């Protein structure tokens, strides 16, 4: 399963911030305007439409991806094995992998 | 407890915008991001934007440092409450991050008690706890077979992954922008870097001690900013970028998912 | 396909490159507040379990 480990968006206060297509996996990024971002003091950017917000998010392997993960395969035929015991004759023992 | 000053010394208790902070969207220091109800053992690993653990300086994981003001408050953990549909059980905290044994719940709802105020934070997240096995319980029993579940650790001595933790961007603080009896008056925390100008034409960058403002007068048309990048942060989605640079601060995760046999 | 099995497709665990068709679509944050609407299919590894 993914983790949308969002990089923290840019907020330019008066005017645009063009985004670029960074090479992160599934790097989704879209500029946005028309904000007034309440951050701990009410808003902080003094404009009202030129307030720009650039959101960016890419996909990343979960921490569970290392450990809890499905796993595909192209499977061919290979070669079968066995730990054949023979308690032979009077030998009475061999437990060998063949 | 003195082996992860990577985070402790260098990271601060971040503050972000909690979504349904009791009433509505506040800005809680314990703003919940990255809820992970992805294990099996009744457990969720959570990140607060608050960095509890040791104090500001050096002692006792079981103390409690969130942000009040621009400032920390590194004090006791006395009355933490993670909860969901029912009250959860804490497992352990380290850094920004807490592990807690929860039941299933449509949401996740976190909060301590500073003492004067409840001051909680709450969030949506689909939670379940299937145990590993062909039995679809709702809860772990006392007995039964052990078999390979997925689960998070109790511990901190942990490096199996690390998340980027570079600087904070600025933050608003209009407590700064006082009035110089006719002009709007900015100040500084400790000599920190205050990034300043107003809609009118006056000082245009702001890298200063306490300035005044020749031109504008209204507090509501000025740049109350705090470039205070002496301590890095978690790279929350509810962070404004520090526009200058990708500073250093690669920092581990404690609560790795491990192959415990529940 | 996003939502379907293998929305995330990494060669191995170490492999920094991958294929993430998750249909991740950001939306604008609401009413002048800092956050990041990420609208996304929960994984085809979430289902498939």
Automatic annotation (TrEMBL), chain A:
Subcellular location: Host cell membrane; Host cytoplasm; Host nucleus; Virion membrane
Origin superkingdom: Viruses
Subunit structure of this chain's protein: The precursor of protein E3/E2 and E1 form a heterodimer shortly after synthesis.
Function: Provides the signal sequence for the translocation of the precursor of protein E3/E2 to the host endoplasmic reticulum. Furin-cleaved E3 remains associated with spike glycoprotein E1 and mediates pH protection of the latter during the transport via the secretory pathway. After virion release from the host cell, the assembly protein E3 is gradually released in the extracellular space.
Protein name as it appears in the record: Structural polyprotein
Organism the protein comes from: Eastern equine encephalitis virus
Shown part of the complete sequence: 851 to 948 of 1242
UniProtKB/TrEMBL annotation, chain B:
GO cellular component terms attached to this protein's record: host cell cytoplasm; host cell nucleus; host cell plasma membrane; T=4 icosahedral viral capsid; virion membrane
MF GO annotations: RNA binding; serine-type endopeptidase activity; structural molecule activity
Localization per Swiss-Prot or TrEMBL: Host cell membrane; Host cytoplasm; Host nucleus; Virion membrane
Keyword flag Lyase: no
Gene Ontology BP terms: fusion of virus membrane with host endosome membrane; proteolysis; symbiont entry into host cell; virion attachment to host cell
Keywords: Capsid protein, Cleavage on pair of basic residues, Disulfide bond, Fusion of virus membrane with host endosomal membrane, Fusion of virus membrane with host membrane, Glycoprotein, Host cell membrane, Host cytoplasm, Host membrane, Host nucleus, Host-virus interaction, Hydrolase, Lipoprotein, Membrane, Palmitate, Protease, RNA-binding, Serine protease, T=4 icosahedral capsid protein, Transmembrane, Transmembrane helix, Viral attachment to host cell, Viral penetration into host cytoplasm, Virion, Virus entry into host cell
Its job: Provides the signal sequence for the translocation of the precursor of protein E3/E2 to the host endoplasmic reticulum. Furin-cleaved E3 remains associated with spike glycoprotein E1 and mediates pH protection of the latter during the transport via the secretory pathway. After virion release from the host cell, the assembly protein E3 is gradually released in the extracellular space.
Subunit structure: The precursor of protein E3/E2 and E1 form a heterodimer shortly after synthesis.
Name of this protein: Structural polyprotein
Source lineage: Viruses, Riboviria, Orthornavirae, Kitrinoviricota, Alsuviricetes
């Amino acid at each position: 399963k993914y983790k949308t480990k969002v990089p923290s968006p840019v907020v330019k206060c008066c005017g645009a911030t063009q985004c670029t297509s960074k090479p992160h996996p599934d790097y989704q990024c879209q500029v946005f305007t028309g904000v007034y971002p309440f951050m701990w003091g009410g808003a902080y950017c003094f404009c009202d439409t030129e307030n720009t917000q650039m959101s960016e998010a890419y996909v990343e392997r979960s921490e569970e991806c290392s450990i809890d993960h499905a796993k595909a395969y192209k499977v061919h035929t290979g070669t079968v094995q066995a730990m054949v015991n023979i308690t032979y004759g009077s030998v009475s023992w061999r437990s060998a992998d063949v | 407890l003195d082996t992860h000053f990577t985070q402790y010394k260098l990271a601060r208790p971040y503050i972000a915008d909690c979504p349904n902070c009791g009433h509505s969207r506040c800005d809680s220091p314990i703003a919940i991001e990255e809820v992970r109800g992805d294990a099996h053992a009744g457990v969720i690993r959570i990140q607060t934007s608050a960095m509890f653990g040791l104090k500001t300086d050096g002692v006792d994981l079981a103390y409690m440092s969130f942000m009040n003001g621009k400032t920390q408050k590194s004090i006791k953990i006395d009355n933490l409450h993670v909860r969901t549909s029912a009250p959860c059980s804490l497992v352990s905290h380290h850094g920004y991050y807490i592990l807690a044994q929860c039941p299933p719940g449509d949401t996740v709802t976190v909060g301590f008690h500073d003492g004067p105020n409840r001051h909680t934070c709450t969030v949506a997240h689909k939670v379940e706890f299937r145990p590993v096995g062909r039995e679809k319980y709702r809860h772990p029993p006392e007995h039964g077979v052990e078999l390979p579940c997925n689960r998070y650790t109790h511990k901190r001595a942990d490096q199996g992954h690390y998340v980027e933790m570079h600087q904070p961007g600025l933050v608003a603080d209009h407590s700064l922008l006082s009035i110089h009896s006719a002009k709007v008056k900015i100040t500084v925390p400790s000599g920190a870097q205050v990034k300043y100008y107003c809609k009118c034409p006056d000082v245009r960058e702001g890298i200063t001690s306490s300035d005044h403002t020749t031109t504008c007068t209204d507090v509501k048309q000025c740049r109350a900013y705090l470039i205070d990048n002496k301590k890095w942060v978690y790279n929350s989605g509810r962070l404004p970028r520090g526009e200058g640079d990708t500073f250093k601060g690669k920092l581990h995760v404690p609560f790795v998912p491990v192959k415990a046999k529940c | 396909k996003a939502g379907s099995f293998g929305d995330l497709q990494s060669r191995t665990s170490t492999s920094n490159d991958l294929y993430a068709n998750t249909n991740l679509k950001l939306q604008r944050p609401q009413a002048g507040i800092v956050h990041t609407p990420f609208t996304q299919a929960p994984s085809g590894f979430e289902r498939w379990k």
